[PDB]
Write a structure and sequence with these properties.
By secondary structure, chain A is an alpha+beta fold. Chain A is about 40% helix and about 20% strand. Chain A contains 13 helices and 17 strands. In chain A, helix 6 crosses helix 13. The structure holds magnesium ion (2 copies).
Chain lengths: ~450, ~450
């Protein structure tokens, strides 16, 4: 969520800049005007209600000195404007009472507004997205305007089989009974594919590990209270699962890891802190209808990159590029062709300044499909989670919050499909060099077709 | 659930033995008698009704040949019986006699619709509560602590070492349980760094070991639909699992999804044994109520699931292979342990026998179970309807055995407590190959102990 001081010109903000961003994503720019308005009303109330406190006091102190010594009149010329220490000392105690009653009744009307405002403010702030990097293509149309930045390896080449067939032909896949047991799209992974996935996971962990990442195995479900801080409203509907306190099944490894450092002060010598998330992830995936394979599925393992960065100096954008670079070199090494894609503003979620997708070329399917997504969220989440930049070297008006980035480096199911269609040959699927050491004996070299293709 | 013919003496049964068993288990010996009664009442109704009918036809048959070939008294008394009314005695009784005898047979025909209800009532209710046959070796007691039999011991289970698994897990900087309780709830945890690596080593080592002994590794869904989770899982809906919303449950073992894999199938005898190494993350609510990774709500588990032939000793030989395979595993990891034969009182209804491998924790000064192996014979297979062969005469069911070979967090604790030293945790030889460089000799203590 954005700093409120950004919506206040007297605090150094530019409501105009945010109005304009709200336009670059495609969303209501008035959502800003309503926030400023409600914020201003909020702020005037705190001011006016402090005046009323003084007027009430003078009232109760004077009704104080008059009971140092029933009888009534309607008697009001007094608007609170005309009300003075002397003006009231000339009045019957019954009249000063009916005035103080008009004050405390106004002081309460403030508290009523303030309350309905504090919310109308927070409901609006939640729906206003983060500032965009200048490089983001401005469009609402994802397919036409996503912009291809780099290409690598041969993305033309066509091969014989789709990954749907190949998971059967090597007999690593039970989708019929998986569909009975867990519901639609449920699956079992058999044999070679289990050993293959373990190799991927090992190679990824080794990779990130030696680049400085700390492998971390997350809990798979989060408290509903911590979840609301790390995700958005369109998350709790589209894909998350409800569990019974009351908890949600994590859709990524970024959720628990963000909440890991919550309400804490990270020291600059310690940044950047890089984690390699290892988790099983669950997505309800509403909107994806259209039959089946292991590619789009409700349950899978991910290896995620999560980085805590300093706010200053562009160290977070430097880290951002370093993060997608790590992702590329991983797929480079496994010999998967891909192209990097800069996602349009309309398709970014609220916390993202910029998003890069690495999309692999699937030779069998003859399509690009997304293996990786990479985001810089700057301080948007950090400020909700209160993760503060912990500098000891000077004195500060307001604290600064760390930058947070997350990339999903490897989603085992999708990556496996990618490997399968790219390494597929005749006898079977060739095992990628970088994975051989991680396969069991007899499974290095090739993975044979044991069964015919549908 | 038991084969109904086991209750029927003339079907080869021994209802005494089943009673005796139910005694040995300490469950209710009565539930047998009830069902022998309801079963017999129905069958008696039925044999009467069927056999009383077989005579009514032989009444009409030889009554047919009578007027056709050639040739008025009361009913002769020496024919009314099942055994005394036979083809011959009908001839000497003429006809218009046979006619009247046939009216007495029809007066005695009854409907069993009333008795059937009662039988099915007993089956649906009681059958599920009569436990499986016991292996001769199962010690008979209801008190585990005193009467569990220790069959074997390996390595030195006396030895003490300085720190428990609770401290080592901190000292290696492998655990954030403070901040994992914030995120996931009570007992929630993060595993980090060296311990994420140790565990991937274990999973790799376990799967090589099972894979090269002929097991097919299988990665199951981590949740199943409420409907199917009911149709499969053992009486122990004891543990409260977890609920997901779709109406789904979070699995507590791989055993449930896999069992559900072969449900309602006929299995080629040629193919058996079918051996699976199940690999899944498991979720246990009720962790039992000072926080380690030993008792937690979520952990990875590698399980052995075997389908076997019902004939001869095959499943009991299989049972021994399985418990052995595990011992050898913990042996190669250099983990001291003893095998425990679990008493009759404590067995699940489906278990014929259960062996527990309990490793020794030097730091803690305690035995804690890393492995449990059970042979359920055809008990569950019969309910799941997983059939042996013949894809007519009496149907047979496969035997099913299952053992959890490695529960990663528990195993990891055993390794730490046993391999601890002054400098760090020595890496166990068979694991070295699977760890990253810098981790192959030793896992260092980078933090002071929580003292
Ligand atoms: Mg996607
Ligand atoms: Mg446990």
């Amino acid at each position: 969520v954005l700093d409120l001081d950004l919506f206040r010109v007297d605090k150094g903000g530019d409501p105009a800049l945010i109005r304009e961003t709200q336009e670059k994503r495609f969303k209501d720019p008035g959502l800003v005007d309503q926030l400023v308005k409600a914020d201003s009303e909020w702020r005037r109330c705190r001011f006016r209600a402090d005046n009323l406190n003084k007027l009430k006091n003078l009232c109760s102190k004077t009704i104080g000195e008059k009971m140092k010594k029933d009888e009534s009149v309607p008697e009001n010329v007094l608007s609170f404007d005309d009300l003075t220490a002397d003006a009231l000392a000339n009045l019957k105690v019954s009249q000063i009472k009916k005035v103080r009653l008009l004050i405390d009744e106004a002081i309460l009307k403030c508290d009523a507004e303030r309350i309905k405002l504090e919310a109308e403010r927070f409901e609006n702030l939640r729906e206003i997205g983060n500032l965009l990097h200048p490089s983001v293509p401005i469009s609402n149309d994802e397919d036409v305007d996503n912009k291809v930045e780099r290409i690598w390896g041969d993305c033309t080449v066509r091969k014989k089989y789709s990954h749907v067939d190949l998971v059967v032909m090597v007999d690593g896949f039970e989708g019929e009974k998986g569909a009975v047991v867990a519901g639609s799209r449920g699956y079992f992974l058999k044999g070679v594919l289990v050993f293959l996935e373990q190799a991927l996971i090992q190679y990824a962990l080794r990779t990130l590990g030696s680049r400085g990442y700390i492998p971390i195995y997350t809990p798979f479900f989060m408290r509903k209270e911590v979840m609301q801080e790390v995700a958005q409203l369109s998350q709790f509907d589209e894909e998350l699962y409800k569990v019974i306190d009351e908890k949600y099944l994590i859709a990524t490894s970024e959720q628990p890891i963000a909440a890991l450092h919550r309400d804490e002060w990270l020291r600059p010598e310690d940044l950047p802190i890089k984690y390699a998330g290892l988790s099983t992830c669950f997505r309800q995936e509403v909107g994806s209808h259209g039959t089946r394979g292991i590619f789009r599925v409700h349950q899978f393992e991910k290896i995620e990159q999560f980085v805590y960065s300093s706010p200053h100096d562009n160290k977070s954008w430097e880290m951002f590029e370093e993060m997608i670079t790590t992702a590329e070199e991983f797929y480079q090494s496994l010999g998967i062709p891909y192209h990097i894609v800069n996602i349009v503003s309309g398709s970014l979620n609220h916390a993202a300044s910029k998003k890069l997708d690495l999309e692999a070329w699937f030779p069998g399917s003859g399509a690009f499909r997304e293996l990786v997504s990479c985001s810089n969220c700057t301080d948007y989440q950090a400020r909700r989670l209160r993760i503060r930049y912990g500098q000891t070297k000077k004195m500060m008006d307001k604290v600064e919050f760390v930058h947070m980035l997350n990339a999903t480096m490897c989603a085992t199911t999708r990556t496996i499909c990618a490997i399968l269609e790219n390494y597929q040959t005749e006898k079977g699927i060739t095992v990628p060099e970088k994975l051989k050491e991680f396969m069991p004996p007899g499974l290095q070299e090739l993975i044979p077709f044991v069964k015919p293709a549908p």
